Scaffold this active site. Sequence first.
Site, PDB file in Angstrom:
ATOM      1  N   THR D   1     -13.113  17.591  38.633  1.00  0.00           N
ATOM      2  CA  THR D   1     -12.051  18.420  39.275  1.00  0.00           C
ATOM      3  C   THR D   1     -12.307  19.912  39.113  1.00  0.00           C
ATOM      4  O   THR D   1     -12.620  20.372  38.021  1.00  0.00           O
ATOM      5  CB  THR D   1     -10.666  18.089  38.701  1.00  0.00           C
ATOM      6  OG1 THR D   1     -10.284  16.783  39.130  1.00  0.00           O
ATOM      7  CG2 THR D   1      -9.621  19.062  39.185  1.00  0.00           C
ATOM      8  N   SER D   2     -12.187  20.644  40.219  1.00  0.00           N
ATOM      9  CA  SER D   2     -12.201  22.099  40.222  1.00  0.00           C
ATOM     10  C   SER D   2     -10.972  22.585  40.956  1.00  0.00           C
ATOM     11  O   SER D   2     -10.807  22.325  42.145  1.00  0.00           O
ATOM     12  CB  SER D   2     -13.448  22.626  40.921  1.00  0.00           C
ATOM     13  OG  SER D   2     -14.598  22.277  40.188  1.00  0.00           O
TER      14      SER D   2
END
Lengths: 204, 243, 237, 196, 235, 233, 198, 250, 222
Positions: D1-2
């Site tokens: 996740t970013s």
Amino acid sequence: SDPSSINGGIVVAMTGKDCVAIACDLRLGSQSLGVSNKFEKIFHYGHVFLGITGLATDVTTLNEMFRYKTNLYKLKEERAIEPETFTQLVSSSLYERRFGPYFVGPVVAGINSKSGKPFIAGFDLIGCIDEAKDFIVSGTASDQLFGMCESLYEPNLEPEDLFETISQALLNAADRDALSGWGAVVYIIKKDEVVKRYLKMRQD
Amino acid sequence: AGYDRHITIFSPEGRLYQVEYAFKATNQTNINSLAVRGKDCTVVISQKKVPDKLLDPTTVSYIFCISRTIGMVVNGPIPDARNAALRAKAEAAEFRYKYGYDMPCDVLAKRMANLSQIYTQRAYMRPLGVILTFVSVDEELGPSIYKTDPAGYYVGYKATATGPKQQEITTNLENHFKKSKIDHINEESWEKVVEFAITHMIDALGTEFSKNDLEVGVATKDKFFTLSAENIEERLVAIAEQD
Amino acid sequence: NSVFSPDGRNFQVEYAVKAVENGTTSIGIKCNDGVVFAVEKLITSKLLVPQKNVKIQVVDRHIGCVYSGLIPDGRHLVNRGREEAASFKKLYKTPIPIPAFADRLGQYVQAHTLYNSVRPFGVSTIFGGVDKNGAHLYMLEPSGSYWGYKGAATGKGRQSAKAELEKLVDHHPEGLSAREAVKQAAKIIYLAHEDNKEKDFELEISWCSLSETNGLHKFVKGDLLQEAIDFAQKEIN
Amino acid sequence: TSIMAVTFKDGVILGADSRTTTGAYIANRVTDKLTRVHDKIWCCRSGSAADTQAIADIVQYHLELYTSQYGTPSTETAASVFKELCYENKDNLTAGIIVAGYDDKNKGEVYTIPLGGSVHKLPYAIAGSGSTFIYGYCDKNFRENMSKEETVDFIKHSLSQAIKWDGSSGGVIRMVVLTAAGVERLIFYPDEYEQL
Amino acid sequence: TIFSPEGRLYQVEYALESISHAGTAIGIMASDGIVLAAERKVTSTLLEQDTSTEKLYKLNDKIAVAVAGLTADAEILINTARIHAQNYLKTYNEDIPVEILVRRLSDIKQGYTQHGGLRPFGVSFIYAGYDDRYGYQLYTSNPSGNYTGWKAISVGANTSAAQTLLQMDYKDDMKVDDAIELALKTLSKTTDSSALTYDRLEFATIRKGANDGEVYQKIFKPQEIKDILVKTGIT
Amino acid sequence: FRNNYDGDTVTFSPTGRLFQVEYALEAIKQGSVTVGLRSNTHAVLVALKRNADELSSYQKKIIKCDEHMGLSLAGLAPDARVLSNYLRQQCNYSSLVFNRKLAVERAGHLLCDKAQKNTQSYGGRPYGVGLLIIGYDKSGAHLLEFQPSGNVTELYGTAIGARSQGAKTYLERTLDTFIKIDGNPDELIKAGVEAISQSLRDESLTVDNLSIAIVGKDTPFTIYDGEAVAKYI
Amino acid sequence: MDIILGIRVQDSVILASSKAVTRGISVLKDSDDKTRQLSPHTLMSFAGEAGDTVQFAEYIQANIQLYSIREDYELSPQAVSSFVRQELAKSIRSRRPYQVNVLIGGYDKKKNKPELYQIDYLGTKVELPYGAHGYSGFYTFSLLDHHYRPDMTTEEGLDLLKLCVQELEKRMPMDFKGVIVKIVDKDGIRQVDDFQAQ
Amino acid sequence: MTDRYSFSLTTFSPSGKLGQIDYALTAVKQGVTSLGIKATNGVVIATEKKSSSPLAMSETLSKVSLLTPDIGAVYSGMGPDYRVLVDKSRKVAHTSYKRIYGEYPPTKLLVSEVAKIMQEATQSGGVRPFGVSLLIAGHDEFNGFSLYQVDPSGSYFPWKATAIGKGSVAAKTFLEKRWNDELELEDAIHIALLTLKESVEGEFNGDTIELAIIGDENPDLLGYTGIPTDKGPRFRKLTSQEINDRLEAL
Amino acid sequence: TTIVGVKFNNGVVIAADTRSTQGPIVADKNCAKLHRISPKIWCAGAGTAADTEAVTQLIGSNIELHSLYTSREPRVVSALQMLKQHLFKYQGHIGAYLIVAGVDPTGSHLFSIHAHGSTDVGYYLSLGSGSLAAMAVLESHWKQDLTKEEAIKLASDAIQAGIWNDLGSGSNVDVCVMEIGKDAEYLRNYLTPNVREEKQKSYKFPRGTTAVLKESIVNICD
Ligand SMILES: [Mg+2]
Ligand SMILES: [Mg+2]
Ligand SMILES: [Mg+2]
Ligand SMILES: [Mg+2]
Ligand SMILES: [Mg+2]
Ligand SMILES: [Mg+2]
Ligand SMILES: [Mg+2]
């Protein structure tokens, strides 16, 4: 150890032409020590038959509970519970104990007294229904029962022939399980009548 | 003073006097209100009486925004009105949280009627002395009016009216729908539906309204909103140039 | 209490109100950036310690409360007002808007007219303060009813106080400053004392002004109080 | 996740990759990690998908009830509700949430709520496993009061580096623009952002 | 619940008053079986007879009750009696002795008489059961929670008149078939209707299982009541 | 007006009166007289103890709540015990949690709020006792009067009980003198003892009759009975 | 490990129970009666965890005695054993389960037959001609498979039991200080006070 | 907060009456007529839609309610009491039956559950009885068709045909005249319509009359195909139009 | 287990294999993993078999009650919201993994739910031990705007990837088609490519083969 291994025990049910058959061994052990030569694992509420394998205390407890529940059913409904309905009542009863389950492998056999059609079902310990039209197996020699049944079974057997088949399945599976055996009992169920036979098997 | 007049138990005739008395309570504010359906809107009109000159007129309302889509007008004393408004709001938020979609107008009304029926049956609760009119453009049913009373009764309306002079307004609208044969106002803009509502209020009650005599709520596909004095003044101007 | 009369009234709530009318006279005045609260303190005896029987109460940091009727009931409301304001601040971070706070008390007071195991409150409360968007003044009756006010009075001298209040609204439609409204509050409390002139009184004032108190609730004390007493003394004669 | 939120001149922008994994298997390559809790209050979620969805759904519930009674909640109010849930339940939740909103008064605001349950108001915020690779880049390229198009670029570049290094991040870059305008959903496909 | 100056329980008395308006129910015990007969509340042609069982209820396979009073109250009690029988069976692997079940029901009634300020159940029961300790048994229980054993008993309306008649023609050495005749004769004499016909009747027996060694409950079908009504010469 | 309006504390009379609370107020007027008064340095309770026979002990009227606080009672005694134990705990709570001596004013507020809940709850009576509370805290000597209605007022001096109106009139007259009696414990007591005398149609107040309590600047709250009051008779 | 044996002959049930109570490295007692009479014609013996053993026994005894007085009647051995099983069944899924195994020996006056029930702590019940709990069964079950007859007298049963006690004394690693023997028949419960050298 | 009347509001009177139950029955009398007729191959329940206003939309208020796919109800008395009984009845069919046996309750059992809910409102603290009488018609595999009346006291009775509410005495007479055990469903609907015409004051048409049947299985109403042993509901509300077709041949 | 979900232009299709297993042993050779939440909302489960059946029946039950209460056709988002809120409450301990698909007044929907209570939305989904085999087929052939026929073929082909390549799956392919206008169509054993070949020999025994100790007739009634 494994609660479903302590006492030993096998049950198997088959369907045939206008009949069902349900069979179980008689052993009740405590690990290696054989304790009872007479421990039956099949029961009947009206014309509905329930075999149960697993921990023997739970076998007994569930018999008393299903007698209780079917007795009340019959009083309110003014008729005997049918195979299909009982199967449902067993399932919901097991799932109700989802996180403290009974350590049992129930098997239901019977003939619908309206449609006259043969019915069998199996469950896991939390009430997952195994609907199968041919045979159901349960207990510490279930692997051996599956093998025997899948080889020996053929559909639409006459009550006299289904008897040989289910017995042969049970005896030979039981003889490969160190915790099953010590005598067997076979019920043949036809709408109209039910015959019960004790088999002669090895006593070791 | 018999018990069957102090609590909600049956009288020998099968009546609940506390429920009956609760209906009388709804007129205590001497405010009238009406609701009509457009082609794709629903409009509620209610009188706004501000007798005391020490009051902040902006805080004097009997119209509530229950949700993004539902509005509710109350006939009855404000303490009970706000009790109901608060509940409906909470029931609305909760419905959306649990079932994943906006609570329909009629469903909320049904729910509020059920709460009312409880006060009708349990001894320790009094009924609320209010009549609740719920409005929206339901995503399934279209423009909607549902109205609940202290008996726990509710139903949908083509249009409705509530208050002391409720009968005048009712027979007025009955006469309109006898003429038109349809069950709404054909009309595109909510602005023209509001005008119709205000116009028919004027005839029925035989009174003129300034911008401060009125309170308006409008529900369109996906908002419910209330008009300010200024939006009403604009509406009052438009009626005058013809009527 | 949970009892509607044959014509839709609540005789118990109506009787609750007579307890309020019986009480001391208290007022509130909404100036252009805040609110002023004033109350008549009847002096029963010289034995009462002056300045030391404080009637006006603060809720959170930004709200003032004054009431007439059964004092203990008013304290009960303010306790609940405080729990209700803490609860709000806890979840929402911001101190409670005044209309939000109004309704909390509203619902609580209304609750006590729903059941036979409870009696309605024997007070009316004048309260308000400054929030995110301006000043607010409220009055809440025993029934649960409350509205926004420009000015409000309750108690013994309620009628004459409203008469004075009505005049101010007419002469000053464009605002009244916080410093001014304080003076006028003192005046009006003097002009409701006329009824209870047989027994002596003491004046309490508090205010909550954006420019004068930085939106916090403060008691008017010292030179400011004295100056407002003089204005009322000089304008009574 | 970013995931990231950035305040700029006219409001605030949220960005996220679209990848969800269980181990090295990509369970979803087109996830929408941008979550609306109010019209102009949005958040980005990291940690347990179950935990954060359940949290977002409760917050959305609280703010809807809030709007019914008291009117538009501030972003700070939205952050406070998130923190309350996250803090009071820190010992059953693995939730890292970034909150971003716009109102007329306070303009664009960003709050980050990391694992503990603490709240931090920031000019911009990064989080998720891919964020670690872009601390240097972001601190070196962020400026206050950037234009919309500048900000979109900053997120576009930042997230593409995060995607490039972190195997848990990937897919498309989604963005949400929050201003007076308006709400604007943006999307950017690998063929565009990889060539940066 | 409260006592009166007389030391009477108002609510119990009035509940018993209620019951004396219910259709008479008769129970007669013989050496080889038990009879339960009861009269239905002034009915109608359109009342479904085949799918109706308002005054007679099966408790377990060896016990039944005849009801006098509020049916809805009786169903509440019947249901708990049914559970009690099943609990006992599950605990001991034996069918509940008749008295133990009667005592339990009675004790629930006594409770509503002593605490809680709820109204008592407006119900009187005649229990007909068989167990292997006392054989055939007949018991009666009313809203006070008192219970007593009988050879013949009635509840509901005209118990006064019905009791005198039973006292007259009851003899300890009766067969079931004689008790059947007595019950119907007694109902016929005491009825506030003209003829006592099949459609105004519920009827049941507990016999020795036709030919077996087991105990069997027959809850008479309407047609059976019509036959047994001609047989005993009332047509 | 008086009819069905004194059933419970949950009913208003058509005049807006609460008769249960007004009747509870009447139990105070029935009680033996007690006087409290203060200067800047000390606060003093003086109480007329009452026996129920010539063979009996005079029943106690002064209760210690903390080192800096105590009260006297008039009316139902068991109610005084209930209330003083509450106050004892509130004082105790403040010491343990905040290491802080409870402001006498806060004790007023707390007692008031406790009384209030019994003027609103169905099937519970109001408290039937009047109390006078004295203490020395961070802002000096304090005296409070507690009514079962919940009203608590800070006074320079006051009296409650049977024929108390005498003592009250005297204290109203003595005001300017006793407010100044500072750093002299024994003068203030003698002023209070003589104040309680105005309330005697009774008898001459004996060494069993008299109950005196003191608290101030450097004196913990202490009770005087029997032989130790002789020197004030 | 506690020896607990039971054998059902033709007109009676015989219970034999070891006399030792051992805690640690010490035998604290050599005359422990591991039995409770439940009713004039029902006897129960027990073995298991230190405290639960007597606590369970006496609790069952209180219950069966309560029943008797309430009903002025003696419950059949089969009903008592069902009651006991259910109590153990409920116990196994409770917070702290009773760790007791039991033998119930009863003479059923209504059928004129002796009855032996073996129930373990799980609530596993089974009716047997002969039974044992613990390790002792690993010896005695095989012996009785050989030596037992369904028509034996009480006296023959006592010889068969003596044969069982001899085997255990020879082969069991622990000293259990002999048994106390009890006979349940139509004329009730009686103890054979001489067995240790009879 | 907290109930004061934790005692029974229905008590016995010196004569043995239970006043509140009597008075609820008097409420049923005041209510609009409803009826049920049992046929060989179905049941019909019918009532009049008496409207509060011509401005009301009477389609939004159903007096006839599906309880399970094979059971339906109608009432006379206090509408709102009915509405909440219907909610509880639907729920109880699930909680006490379907969630246990995997099938819907037979008619008598559900009726019995409803009766229990009403019985309780007659004994519990601080409540009045329900002001309704219900007619519950249904079908199950083992019992066939049935019609039950349920009263405020908790009492139920099976009926071949019956009427409750306003004109109930006259309508019951008109049914004893007309009912027999060879009736087809179509004949019963026809009788239901005739019986209802004596009761109706104003207009008598598909808009002012509410009528439902427990007939045959409606596979088109099921919503899915594939499972051959699921054939659909037997409960069916007749439409405004459908009613009018049987009134031109009436 | 292989369960898939495929959206098409006017609806949604779900499919599943028909093998249940206790470890390496096949318990049921032809069961049904396609379950009904309501007439037009259908469900497929993987993981604890009792769990997916129970959570499906409970929510199904409640959805029916909701529908009756609100006078409206059940929506897929309601089933999804109730399932996820329930599963979440049980932190995972109810090992239900579900593909929930259906049509409602607001269009057509396809969702996944994981045991801990997270949901995702998509145009094509797979779950089960055969999930990867199926997904590679899905990623190979899915396009936007599939016709009904193509969607069935694709979903059917995905279950076959599971059947032939995953030991956890086998036997037959069940399908359910939910289209916006129509009734939902359940299609039991849509494919049967795993028929047991005829055995080499008959095993029926000559009567009397089995030794019998004793015998008796059993009483059924009373
Ligand atoms: Mg196995
Ligand atoms: Mg073997
Ligand atoms: Mg009340
Ligand atoms: Mg009420
Ligand atoms: Mg006023
Ligand atoms: Mg990557
Ligand atoms: Mg495979």
